[PDB]
Write a protein that binds this ligand. Sequence first.
Ligand code: ZN
Lengths: 515, 89, 649
Amino acid sequence: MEKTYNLNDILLSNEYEKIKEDIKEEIINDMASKKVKYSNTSEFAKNDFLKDEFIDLVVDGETYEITYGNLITLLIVARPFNHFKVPMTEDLLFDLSDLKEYQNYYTTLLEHFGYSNEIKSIIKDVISELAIFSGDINVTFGNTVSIKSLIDLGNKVKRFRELLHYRLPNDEALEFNDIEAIIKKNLDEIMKILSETDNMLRYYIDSGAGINSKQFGQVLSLVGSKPDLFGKIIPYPINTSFLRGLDVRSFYINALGARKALITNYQQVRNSGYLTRKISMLLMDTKLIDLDDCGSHENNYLSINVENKDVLKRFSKRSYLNNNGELVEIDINDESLIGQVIKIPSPTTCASNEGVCRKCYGKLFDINKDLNIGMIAVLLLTDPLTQRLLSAKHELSKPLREIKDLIETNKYIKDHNVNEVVNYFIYLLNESGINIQSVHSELIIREMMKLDDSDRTQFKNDKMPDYEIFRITDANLKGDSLSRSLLFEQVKKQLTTLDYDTFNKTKSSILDKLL
Amino acid sequence: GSILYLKIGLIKKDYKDLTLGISNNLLSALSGDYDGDVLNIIPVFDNKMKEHFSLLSPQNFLVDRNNGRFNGDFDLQKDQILGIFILNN
Amino acid sequence: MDDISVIKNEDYEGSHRFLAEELLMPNANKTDGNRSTMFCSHLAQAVTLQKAEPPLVYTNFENQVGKYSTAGYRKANSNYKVIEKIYKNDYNYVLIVQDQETGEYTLFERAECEFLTEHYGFQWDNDKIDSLKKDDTIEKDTVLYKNTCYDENMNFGYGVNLNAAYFSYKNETLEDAIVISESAAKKLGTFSVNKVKVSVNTNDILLNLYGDNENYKGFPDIGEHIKNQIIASRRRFDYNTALYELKNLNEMRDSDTPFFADGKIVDIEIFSNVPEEELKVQKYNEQVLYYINKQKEFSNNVYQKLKKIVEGKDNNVSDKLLHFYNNCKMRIDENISYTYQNSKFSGFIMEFTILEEEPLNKGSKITGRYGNKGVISKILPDDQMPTVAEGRFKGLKADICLNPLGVFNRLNPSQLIEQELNWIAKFIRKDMEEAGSNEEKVSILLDFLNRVNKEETELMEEFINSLNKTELEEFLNDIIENGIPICQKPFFGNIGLDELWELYNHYDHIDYFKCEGISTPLIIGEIYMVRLKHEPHSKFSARSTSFMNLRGLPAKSKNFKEHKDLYSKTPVRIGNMEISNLSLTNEMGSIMDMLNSYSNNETNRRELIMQLLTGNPFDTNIDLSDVESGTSKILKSLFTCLGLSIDDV
Ligand SMILES: [Zn+2]
């Protein structure tokens, strides 16, 4: 261990892996030799592990003051600089104290190095190595759990002692909202006191891995009321707590709740993921065409109003016409766009008949050139939405059903216009809680599109043709390519009846090769 | 990316062993658990096929096709998050 | 509901009539409903253990369920007198006994193991029955045999107690992974029995797989163990192919039919529909002839022994006796044709029942008594496992290390209760070892038991007062070497947090175990374990090239059930989202090429095998044709015969 180092040197030197191995070996040997003592109080016992230090680092012409662990991880992540022999710069340094920040750090690297394949490979390598190092450190440091820690804490702190020793004041009538408020405040108090004081589970709750606040509050503090199978609160909430014991009536309530969960799981699995079938079956044919600009009209740009920063998040990597009308990149951090209706390019309005121009896809286009854009859109929509709906069924579910209806039933589309429907879709996406880039949504709308003249050149003129949209199954069955229609359901009327003019319809497609 | 393009690295020597080893960080991307899931393997032979499916390698999925950042599914899972926290803090 | 208001704790106070399954699991008062449901399902899924032991923490009901359940032993209904004994084979025999008072006769039998269903079964501890001899009176409560689940005194055992500690191991206990030592895994030994039948017609012949020319045995004898996972094989004889294929009978040919299993032969049963003269002139049927003669001799002896009983109308017999005797009389008599599955067969059919033990396979499952399921991830030499090496208990080793990720999320603090109870019991055992005089050590023992369970303490004090001095000393020896049992009621009378609080307050000598080299002083305790059935071997289908269906496409087959295939080998099918995600890459031509090469196109798959067999093994440069696939052609037939047609562009 040395008072100071120059990281630029250790990466440029050939002994980089040697120094890392030496440092790691020293950490493991040292901290395995020592022992951990728990103060079991607000104060901290004297543990003198060398893993925590106050060492220095001279780089970029300045000296940073970091500990031993920060040093080992900083060398472990800065591996690309060594691989490409490029010096590190101050902006390329991040406070590694917060783990989530590592996330951001990784992202920014992918920017200064050109989105190459080699940097992707080295990122995978460093991730794997960091995992292995965490493994060895995790054996050589214990993480056990037992309630004796809780008992000793309660002996040390009487606040926690009486907190665990508490029941509802049943002497008065208690309302549902009141008991929820009191249980919330008690759970927050439990977590606060647990984090404040030293204990054998301090790191557990500070890191947050493997601890759920709700289950913790239920186990130590009182259980709280539970709903009936039909969704009604019981009049007699469980005054006791899981650790303390249970009531026979409470036992019945718990059993009923468990059976409700089992029934809900049964129906949820029976659901079978049916919607993704047709949504993908329709959206999959969409393609991308390498062209600079569709050359669409200015009025073809659809207008969207801003109400919160969430819509700005939905509209990243795109461009808005400015006061001069030039399409400048939208900045989510920017706030001058609050409460403004502005026009944005979109795939649903792109004038390219071959596909979608790179202008409509924005700066994102360069990323996606490898893969079927529409397929990513459909899958990235169907996954979190289904997961959220299924979890909610396990209130917030109603907006999800509303989104399903908007996509399926199509009454709102028959009653309104494209700008209105896309704004409603954005609002529904916000309500649902999932976050997806709006570009994919606009692409689903582009597939949703239906117009009289198959040519998009008219679309580039001042007035757009008819802009009607139908049901998802109807829209796919509308699709003039018969290969995708046959692969769908309802083929009976398609083949034996003339309602859908399947004899008439004809168009090329990807699945057409599959036949 | 519920399909992965993976490369064999080691043949298990123990005859009675019949389970497929897999690194922990791939658990989230393919949405599985060690509880008893049954997963399917399709070998690939043609070299041109290898090149074409290289786009299905996990390194490709490392970039988020949603937002273009580092993918959270390949981020460190629970236990390693804990351990690195011990090392740092 | 008002019924929810109707139920009162006073109605059910001091009684467990409400609770049915958790009668076998201690301390249900603190667990959640989902976990209880999981545990009930597991207890529906428990398997026999070769080293079964009774759990340390018991709820007074294991003995009850064991005694009432009647699929694990055979208690003589009344006092009887054995009149005679016969033996069929080396490992099995039958007993003819007579009722002492009623004057009615009855049969018993023995066998090394009992076949429960398919794989599952269990070995039988027939010591008690085999100890019996001729002309000896049997008693009403005497049990002729029992499964290993039952101890010497009918103590119920469905699992075993193991040392466990909460510990994360190399990021390898992530999710529900469980790591176990080699000795403990050697303990969790489980039996398995299979029944398999083979048919031999006039055409197919056996092979001398086992032994020299003189000892022609196509299947291992009773003592022998099946070798190379193959019981027997048959060659399909043909009159024309009698000059090349039938040659070298000792060595198997490529195109034959073998059978696959493992273990040791436990019993053999042959049904033959052919006259014995052919068998006499058959050299490759000497073993089956020998077995048939043995079985026939057995039947003759039993008939001769029981004739005096059966023809005596005055005698009273069970319907079982008459059924068995009629069966043997059927066997001995001539002109008795057998028609399996409502159809006569030619040649003979013979059935082998086989038993074998398995240790723990990497990837099996173990769960406690509260649904804390898991999968055996990796197993280690016990030296490479955390151990404590301080104080009196220096050198203690923990066999298994559970996942300490979170128990609070799984909602069952009961496991921790059991663990700390058993650890405290360990410390008490040490303390009473330190004791010198019997009176003071029994005093401290009952003191602790009173701290935990007063009434059971009263029962212990009654017992120890009952015991004689030397027996009493032998008892304390058993306590110090085994441990102390703790009674724990399921819902009414169990421990809570406050009693543990008081225990730790008074037991200031309790201290965390300081493991060597480990930063934290982890805790080791006994926990009950039971092994489930879901094994990785149960889903292992893998196919290279098997029988195709009428459509020239892959299809599963019935060889696996008839034990003709080592592995299950049932192909996988590609579905909706499979084709979808494969088309996530912009290589539709590539996906179509793969589908055509694998199964769809016969010519394309054939040329794939041709190119792939030869050429560089390291580098495969496939070449594909453009022949129309079978699927497209059959769809063309569909359309044209419908009146539809085909017309590209
Ligand atoms: Zn465009």
